[PDB]
Design a protein that fits this description.
The PDB classes it as lyase. The entry lists the keywords golobular protein, Lyase. The protein has helices at residues 128-131, 155-160, 217-223, and strands at residues 30-31, 37-38, 45-48, 54-59, 64-68, 76-79, 86-95, 106-107, 114-122, 138-147, 170-172, 188-193, 204-209, 213-215, 254-255. It is mostly beta strands and 258 residues long. The strands form two sheets. Strands 2, 3, 4, 5, 6, 7, 9, 10, 11, 12, 13, 14 and 15 form a 13-stranded mixed β-sheet that branches. It has a two-stranded parallel ribbon with strand order 1-8. A hairpin with a 4-residue loop joins strand 4 and strand 5. The longest helix is centred in the C-terminal third of the chain and has 7 residues, at 217-223. It is globular, with a radius of gyration of 17 Å. The chain starts with 29 loop residues before the first strand and ends with a strand. It binds zinc ion (ZN).
Length: 258
């Protein structure tokens, strides 16, 4: 009876196994655009993905994750609110059963159809496992998805999902360029928060882009054909794998733009 997104093990239950669920810097949060302060010290976000090396895509039982070779400085995030260099390790999404919900962060209470997380770890901690034990261990770049025109750069991801339908399935996924998932503007909000799946560690500097990317209805529909369950088990569609907004508590969200 482990954590999940069902009726008996979903986000409202997680605190029982992971008490930090009720912590002081939990994510996601609602971004109140009128309360976020423009910060004239925030540098432009530097995203250097030209040498990114994807390896594999995995159905991990709550989402799918595209993993990268992070053994060299190849795909790095720096600048913005960050000190130092953070290396890309994986990206994954959160999505809904319907276009009207699916994002984890919300903007003035608005829910998007999905949310992309590009997860990076602080190179000063040597690897991901050590980084998540530190308050500044991770930087996660969050990008909202809305349903409209197709995102061509996403299609290679959508087309491989049939091969990883059920929990535990993985597939070779090389030469995928995550630059094809970025919106035009890198304007962002930033605040200190946490992983949004257990163990919910409070190790993340969140950088959430203001500009959503558009994906097609057909693209998001294919996300919804994935399964939470393993092969040979009763079918449960992988939908609504998003944690709802958590109390902001003692935190200020800063904006890179006015
Ligand atoms: Zn996530």
């Amino acid at each position: 009876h482990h954590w999940g997104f069902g009726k008996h093990n979903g986000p409202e239950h997680w605190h029982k196994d992971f008490p930090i669920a009720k912590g002081e810097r939990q994510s996601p949060v609602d971004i109140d655009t009128h309360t976020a302060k423009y910060d004239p010290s925030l540098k432009p976000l530097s995203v250097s993905y030209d040498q990114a090396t994807s390896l594999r895509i995995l159905n991990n039982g709550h989402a799918f994750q595209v993993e990268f070779d992070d053994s060299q400085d190849k795909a790095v995030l720096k600048g913005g609110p960050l000190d130092g260099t953070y290396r890309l390790i994986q990206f994954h999404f959160h999505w809904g059963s319907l276009d009207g919900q699916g994002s984890e962060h919300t903007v003035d209470k608005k829910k998007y159809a999905a949310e992309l997380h590009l997860v990076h770890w602080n190179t000063k901690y040597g690897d991901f496992g050590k980084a998540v034990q530190q308050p500044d261990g991770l930087a996660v770049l969050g990008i909202f998805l809305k349903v409209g025109s197709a995102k061509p750069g996403l299609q290679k991801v959508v087309d491989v999902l049939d091969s990883i339908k059920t929990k535990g399935k993985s597939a070779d996924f090389t030469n995928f360029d995550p630059r094809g998932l970025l919106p035009e503007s890198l304007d962002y909000w930033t605040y200190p928060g946490s992983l949004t799946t257990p163990p919910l560690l409070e190790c993340v500097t969140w950088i959430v882009l203001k500009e959503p990317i558009s994906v097609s209805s057909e693209q998001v529909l294919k996300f919804r054909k994935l399964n939470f369950n393993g092969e040979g088990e009763p079918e449960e569609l992988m939908v609504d794998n998003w944690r709802p907004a958590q109390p902001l508590k003692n935190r200020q969200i800063k904006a890179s733009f006015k």
